C-alpha cells in the first residue's frame, strides 16, 4: 500500500515538473467571456463569475491590475501563483482553465466553485461536529502530502481560503504565498491566527508550518473559534509562542491528543515533521475511521452539500459594488509580466 503512494507521488512530481518548466500562456482572451457578478475583491485583484460565450460554461476569473501589483510589490507572488496553478493536479486544488493578459490586467480563469468559502458556513453554523471537521481535515492532509511532495509550502491555510464545491468537497484556490523550496525559508507571511511560532519568532522555517496551520484549522472548525485570538495580532503572537492552549470541554480525547501534537511549539516533536512524516497524522486515532483512498477518490458522502440552484448561482457569495474592467490604451508594466 505504501508502494502505491510512492509510485503515485513519483508520477505526480514528473507531471508537475514538466508543466512547471514549460508553463501555458495566452489560452483565451477577455471578449470570450461575459461578466456576471463580482465574487470577491481585495488588494490588487477581483474575482468575478463569468460565462464563456462560445460554450456557456461558467468560470471564476481572477483579474489583477498590473500597476497595483507592481505598486504593492507582488510581481513574483503573482507570477508564481499562476505558474503553480497551471502545473499542479490534485482533486482538492482548483483547476486553472485559461490565463491571458492585456494592456492593464492579468487574468486567471478557474473552475467556478459555487458553494462558497468554508468561512461563511462555519460562522453561520457556529461550529462543525468532529466527523464533519475530520472530513475536511482529511482532504487538507492529502493536499499537503501532495504539495509537500512537490517541495511546495502552502503558508495560507484558513477557512477564508477553502471553497466548498457542489459535492461538498474542498477546493484550495490561493497560491500567492506558496513557495517551492526544499530547505528553509524566512518570509514573514500568513494570517496572524494561523502563524506557526517559528514564523513569529523570525526563525528560518520549513513545511512544518503547514502542519501547525492544520492544527489551527482543525481546532477552529471543531470549536467555532481559533485556538489563539486577541484584540491585536501582537497579543495573538504572544499566545501562539507561549506553548499553552485550552480546549473546549466537548473536544474528544483523540481530538485533543492530535491537536497537542500538531500545535506543538517544539519542531522536533510536531506531527508531520517527524521521521514517519504525514503517516503520524494519517494513523492517529482521531483518523481511525478515515478511508484515505475513498476520500481521495471522492467516494465518501459529504456531511454538508451547499445550496446550488443551477449553473451561475451565486447565493453562497457576498454582494460587492460592481466596477468597470478598464483596459488602458497604453500597455502597462510589460517587461515585468512577460512570463505570465
Amino acid at each position: 500500500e505504501q508502494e502505491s503512494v510512492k509510485e503515485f507521488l513519483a508520477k505526480a512530481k514528473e507531471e508537475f515538473l514538466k508543466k512547471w518548466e514549460s508553463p501555458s500562456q495566452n489560452t483565451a482572451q477577455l471578449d470570450h467571456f461575459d461578466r456576471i457578478k463580482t465574487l470577491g475583491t481585495g488588494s490588487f485583484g477581483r474575482v468575478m463569475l463569468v460565462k464563456h460565450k462560445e460554450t456557456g460554461n461558467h468560470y471564476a476569473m481572477k483579474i489583477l491590475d498590473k500597476q497595483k501589483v507592481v505598486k504593492l510589490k507582488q510581481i513574483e507572488h503573482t507570477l508564481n501563483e499562476k505558474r503553480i496553478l497551471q502545473a499542479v493536479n490534485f482533486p482538492f486544488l482548483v483547476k486553472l482553465e485559461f490565463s491571458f493578459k492585456d494592456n492593464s490586467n492579468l487574468y486567471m480563469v478557474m473552475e467556478y466553485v459555487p458553494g462558497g468559502e468554508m468561512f461563511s458556513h462555519l460562522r453561520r453554523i457556529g461550529r462543525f461536529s468532529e466527523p464533519h471537521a475530520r472530513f475536511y481535515a482529511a482532504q487538507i492532509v492529502l493536499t499537503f502530502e501532495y504539495l509537500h511532495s512537490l517541495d511546495l509550502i502552502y503558508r495560507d491555510l484558513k477557512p477564508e481560503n477553502l471553497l466548498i464545491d457542489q459535492q461538498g468537497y474542498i477546493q484550495v484556490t490561493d497560491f500567492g504565498f506558496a513557495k517551492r523550496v526544499k530547505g528553509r525559508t524566512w518570509t514573514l507571511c500568513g494570517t496572524p491566527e494561523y502563524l506557526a511560532p517559528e514564523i513569529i519568532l523570525s526563525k528560518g522555517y520549513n513545511k512544518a508550518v503547514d502542519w501547525w496551520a492544520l492544527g489551527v484549522l482543525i481546532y477552529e472548525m471543531a470549536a467555532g473559534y481559533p485556538p489563539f485570538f486577541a484584540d491585536q495580532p501582537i497579543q495573538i503572537y504572544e499566545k501562539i509562542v507561549s506553548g499553552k492552549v485550552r480546549f473546549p470541554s466537548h473536544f474528544s480525547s483523540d481530538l485533543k491528543d492530535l491537536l497537542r501534537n500538531l500545535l506543538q511549539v517544539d519542531l522536533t516533536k510536531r506531527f508531520g515533521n517527524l521521521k514517519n512524516g504525514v503517516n503520524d497524522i494519517k494513523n492517529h486515532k482521531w483518523f481511525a475511521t478515515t478511508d484515505w483512498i475513498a476520500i481521495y477518490q471522492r467516494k465518501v458522502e459529504a456531511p454538508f452539500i451547499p445550496k446550488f440552484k443551477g449553473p451561475g448561482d451565486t447565493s453562497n457569495f457576498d454582494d460587492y459594488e460592481e466596477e468597470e474592467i478598464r483596459v488602458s490604451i497604453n500597455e502597462k508594466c510589460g517587461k515585468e509580466f512577460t512570463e505570465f
Binding site: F119, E160, F177, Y225, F229, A230, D231, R246, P248
Partner: peptide
Amino acid sequence: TTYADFIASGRTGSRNAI
C-alpha cells in the same frame, strides 16, 4: 466564556494576511 472572548476580540470577520 471563551466564545464571548472571541466575539469581544473583534476578529470574527474574514481575516487578512499580514
